[PDB]
Amino acid sequence: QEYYPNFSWDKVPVAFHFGKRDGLMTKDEAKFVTSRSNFIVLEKAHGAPDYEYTEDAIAKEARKLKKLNPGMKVIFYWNSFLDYNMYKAHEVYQNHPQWWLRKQDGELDFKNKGLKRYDLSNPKVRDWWTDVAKNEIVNGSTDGIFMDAFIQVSNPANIKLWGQKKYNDIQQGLKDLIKETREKLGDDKLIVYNGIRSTFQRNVGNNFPDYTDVVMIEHFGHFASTSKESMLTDIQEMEKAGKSGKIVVFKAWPGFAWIDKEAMSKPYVEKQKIAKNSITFPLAAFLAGAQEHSYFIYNWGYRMEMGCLEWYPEFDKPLGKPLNDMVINGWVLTREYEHALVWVNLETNEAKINWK
């Protein structure tokens, strides 16, 4: 835990996860982020279109943030499944068509807009993929890697496309990729992966605990995880992961997301007002199960302009250390901090934070 970001219970622990379009962060934006958190994940296409390649922009942005805050942990986003076109490594991957994953019917496997999906069962793809992470991170400005799209790899709909045998090899290839990543990165670098996800159809927990330091709860109380059963599972997974020593990133939403076309057409001040009015329930749910090194993120997207730099009075109130563990009473969760008493009813979507 010596290479973890410095954690404190003094106020609500928050983290950042975004990519800024139209160049790197300004000095004011960099000061805002580094003075309020020690933990930021920089997304794909950060700095676009001013920076052609994500590797350059993230490396430069990490240096800028670390000048203001030497204790800042800056994470390099590197999708484990999808071949996005704004990296240098994308050009290398294009020159290896023999690597490209193909479905059962022999057709190339890709998502919409020609986004190829990696064949993680191929050791040559894994060695190239981990080489990209190593060359960017070790002896570099970043302190770790964000391996995304783990859930998409294990999606049972892939068995129809790949067949059971190919699906099993790809699942095992993902496990090897994580182990190879830790081998090349070393012991002093953080490994983040998109983990916990609770839905009616599938429940995914901290299912890759080996060699990893941070697990994300991306979809709390939103998308397909709005049910009381899903929300309780997400909060319990945070509590279980945190008690195991994991950093947990608890991503909450203001009742809407950037994929909502009608909500995105609202005035920005209306988005702020909705977000300001909708923070109590997800924050109380976070504080109910939050452990040491648990972090709260509250916005409506992964581009910086989608509320990522908004601030709320709840984030300035004293919090203090937790005095007890989470108490579950049916669908009602309670937690007591030194300066806050937390109450949340997942069934009725009601919550109250009694600051004191």
Author numbering: 20 to 375
Q: Which statements did the authors publish about this structure?
A:
We present the 2.0 Å resolution X-ray crystal structure of MeGH168, demonstrating a (β/α)8-barrel fold. Analysis using MATTHEWS_COEF showed two protein molecules in the asymmetric unit with a Matthews coefficient of 2.65 Å3 Da−1 and a solvent content of 53.67%. PISA analysis indicated that dimers of the protein are unlikely to form in solution. Additionally, an antiparallel β-sheet fold, consisting of four β-strands, is present in the C-terminal region. The −3 and −4 subsites displayed no ligand interactions as these fucosyl residues did not make direct interactions with the enzyme, making it unclear whether there truly are −3 and −4 subsites; therefore, we opted to omit analysis of these subsites. A comparison of MeGH168 with this structure revealed conservation of the catalytic residues (Asp167 and Glu237 in MeGH168) in structurally conserved loop regions in the central base of the catalytic groove. In particular, an antiparallel β-hairpin in the predicted positive-subsite region of MeGH168 is likely to have a profound effect on reshaping the active site of this enzyme. Similarly, Asn267, His209 and Tyr266, present in the suggested +3 subsite, were not present in MeGH168. The lack of structural and sequence conservation in the anticipated positive subsites of MeGH168, combined with presence of a large β-hairpin loop insertion, suggests that this enzyme may be able to accommodate substrates with alternative chemical characteristics in comparison to Fun168A.
The genome of the marine bacterium Muricauda eckloniae sp. DK169 contains an extensive polysaccharide-utilization locus that targets fucoidan from brown algae. In general, the inferred catalytic mechanism of GH168s is a two-step retaining mechanism utilizing two carboxylic acid-containing amino acids as nucleophile and acid–base residues.
